[PDB]
Amino acid sequence: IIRGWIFGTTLDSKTQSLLIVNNATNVVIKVCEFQFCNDPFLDVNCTFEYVSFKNLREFVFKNIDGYFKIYSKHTPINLVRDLPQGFSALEPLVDLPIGINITRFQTLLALH
Amino acid sequence: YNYRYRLFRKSNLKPFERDISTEIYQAGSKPCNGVEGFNCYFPLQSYGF
Ligand SMILES: *[C@@H]1O[C@H](CO)[C@@H](O[C@@H]2O[C@H](CO)[C@@H](O)[C@H](O)[C@H]2NC(C)=O)[C@H](O)[C@H]1NC(C)=O
Ligand SMILES: *[C@@H]1O[C@H](CO)[C@@H](O)[C@H](O)[C@H]1NC(C)=O
Ligand SMILES: *[C@@H]1O[C@H](CO)[C@@H](O)[C@H](O)[C@H]1NC(C)=O
């Protein structure tokens, strides 16, 4: 159900906003001056673009010196109720030279 | 007269940050709210080559 993220400052076409849209491991990434809808969902100056419970996915996102860094992990799990105890280490996926300020974010869901 | 820079910014640049924004800024106290004038000199100045 969970299929992307919005990152940026004003999130309202007055400036660039990092948009990630994903279907597990194929991805579109863009940073353009997007005008979103008021309730963001995926229906079941454009200066950068890039393209690539049973389960748990983990990520770390950090934005340093004009580069955006992503780390991840995938694993199956047994604790339906909550975030599981035990030890695991994420590994880097990508490092993007996007040159953008970020102070807000939001998750994107696939809806009917 | 085309080649361009922002004469002001309300926050200094982070290393390798970029900023396209066409805000007029407070060049003074008054919130000009889309007016250009005193308190609001629009920043995207250009060289005269
Ligand atoms: C990154 O974007 C934020 C806005 O989301 C900027 O923060 C504002 O900065 C001004 C001063 O220039 C303050 O008066 C506001 O109160 C700040 N707002 C927030 C939400 O913190 C921030 O300055 C930008 N960073 C850079 C380096 O330009
Ligand atoms: C992922 O979604 C995009 C449309 O948003 C599509 O172009 C792409 O082919 C899809 N890939 C997969 C693996 O479904
Ligand atoms: C890019 O900026 C110009 C003004 O410099 C503006 O006219 C144009 O519509 C912007 N492009 C997008 C995709 O918003």
B-chain residues near A67 (CB < 8 A):
16
In terms of Cα–Cα distance, which of A100, A74, A69 is closest to A88?
A74
Q: What would the DSSP string read from start to end of A29-81?
A: EE-S-----SS-EEE-----EEE---EEEEEEEEEETTEEEEEEEEEE-S-SS
Q: Which two tokens stand for residue A36?
A: 């979103």
A-chain residues near B21 (CB < 8 A):
14-15
To 5 degrees, how large is the angle CA A5–CA A21–CA A29?
Answer: 95
- The rounded Å distance from CA B30 to ligand 3 centre is 27
C-alpha to C-alpha distance for B21 and B9, rounded to whole angstroms: 10
Beta bridge partners of A73: A58
Q: Which amino acid is at A100?
A: I
Q: Which two tokens stand for residue A76?
A: 């199956």
- The rounded Å distance from CA A37 to ligand 2 centre is 20
Resolution (angstroms) equals 3.6
To 5 degrees, how large is the angle CA A45–CA B18–CA A10?
Answer: 70
A-chain residues near B17 (CB < 8 A):
66, 99-101
Beta bridge partners of A64: A67
Length of chain A in terms of residues written: 112
C-alpha to C-alpha distance for B48 and B42, rounded to whole angstroms: 17
- Strands of the sheet containing A2-8, edge to edge, are A41-43, A104-111, A2-8, A18-23, A26-30, A49-51
To 5 degrees, how large is the angle CA A59–CA A63–CA A68?
Answer: 75
Cα A107 to Cα A4, B30, B47: the distances in Å are: 6, 37, 42
C-alpha to C-alpha distance for A26 and A41, rounded to whole angstroms: 18
HSE of A54, CA atoms in CB hemisphere, 13 A: 0
C-alpha to C-alpha distance for A90 and A46, rounded to whole angstroms: 31
Q: What would the DSSP string read from start to end of B1-49?
A: ---B--S--SSPPPTT----------SSSS--TT--BTTB-----B---
Contact B20 A67 (CB under 8 A): no
Neighbouring C-beta atoms of residue A33, cutoff 10 Å: 16
* Nearest atom within ligand 1 for CA of residue A101: 1
Which letter does DSSP use for residue A24 in this model? Answer: T
- The rounded Å distance from CA A111 to ligand 2 centre is 15
Q: Ligand 1 pocket: which residues have CB below 6 Å?
A: A 9, 101, 103; B 10-11, 14
